[PDB]
């Protein structure tokens, strides 16, 4: 146990500093040490109970406190990275991914800060499921099932409930499409994701005023919703809205992904071309930090 603990620590030190911002090879170092000494225990030591126990204790010792954990001065840097690794696996065949997630599980069984990892993974799963960038949902369901078997019952039910929420929203969209199929379709297509507030970790943002270009449509849909279901109200989050743009002016056709903020800024250019920060700030009351981040994203 002492030798294998020092060996895992030595491997992590040999990595040292490039593992703060790259979770893949940190988790892979941990897994390489674990697999080497697990094979050694199974073959040479006849799969004895005490020797596997020593393996488990040393592995759990060097996972939770190592070079990057000390450097960040937070043991929660160990599950966080693991969570990020999961995200890296589930962005946008099946057997390889399933084996990789089982390896993620054999790492995760040694995590003592399970709530930190679970909160990180819940927020990342929410960010994934909201708009786009999700792999085959078979993998996500299998991940939720593995968390079911490993952890308790309530948190995985929370995750399954937000999955059921996205499914219910998809079913409502299908119902709306069916309703429009046997009627007169509108001039434009509207898509919404109706999500439970309790299950999703989102927070209310700054107040925003709807422009006059969509007020009539919004009022009409609100009246229709009240007629169909007067007992439910929609808390609109304009910060998380999306948008696709096609530039039909060049020889080649491009696709641009941008939010409503981008289109509002572009629509503001119909009158002037050069904009002063002070004028827009006084007119719209926008904090310096958020617009600075927006400009940095624009430049990057």
């Amino acid at each position: 146990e002492t030798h294998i603990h020092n060996q895992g620590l030595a491997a992590i030190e040999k990595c040292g500093e490039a593992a703060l911002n790259d979770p893949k090879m940190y988790v892979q170092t941990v897994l390489d040490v674990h697999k080497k000494y697990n094979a050694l225990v199974m073959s040479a030591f006849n799969n004895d109970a005490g020797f596997v126990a020593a393996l488990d204790k040393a592995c759990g010792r060097f996972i939770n406190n190592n070079a990057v954990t000390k450097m960040a001065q937070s043991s929660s840097k160990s599950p966080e990275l693991l969570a990020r690794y999961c995200d890296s696996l589930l962005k946008k065949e099946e057997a390889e991914l399933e084996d990789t997630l089982n390896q993620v599980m054999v790492v995760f069984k040694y995590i003592e800060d399970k709530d930190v990892f679970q909160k990180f993974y819940a927020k990342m799963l929410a960010k994934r499921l909201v708009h786009q960038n999700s792999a085959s949902d078979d993998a996500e369901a299998s991940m939720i099932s593995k968390l079911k078997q490993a952890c308790g019952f309530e948190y995985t039910s929370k995750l399954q409930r937000m999955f059921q929420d996205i499914g219910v929203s998809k079913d409502l969209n299908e119902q709306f499409k069916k309703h429009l199929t046997n009627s007169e379709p509108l001039d434009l297509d509207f898509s919404i994701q109706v999500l439970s507030s309790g299950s999703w970790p989102f927070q209310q943002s700054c107040t925003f005023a709807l422009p006059s270009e969509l007020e009539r449509s919004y009022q009409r849909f609100t009246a229709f919703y009240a007629s169909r279901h007067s007992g439910r109200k929609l808390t609109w989050l304009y910060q998380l809205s999306k948008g696709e743009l096609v530039t039909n002016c060049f020889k080649n056709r491009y696709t641009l992904q941008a939010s409503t903020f981008q289109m509002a800024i572009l629509l503001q250019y119909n009158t002037e071309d050069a904009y002063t920060v002070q004028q827009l700030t006084d007119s719209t009351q926008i904090k310096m930090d958020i617009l600075a981040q927006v400009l940095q994203i624009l430049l990057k």
Partner: peptide
């Protein structure tokens, strides 16, 4: 030239009970 049109609008909303 420099003309933009709206075709799709993907929004997000949360539902909660109106009793309280």
């Amino acid at each position: 030239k420099k003309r933009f049109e709206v075709k799709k609008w993907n929004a997000v909303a949360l539902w909660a009970w109106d009793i309280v």
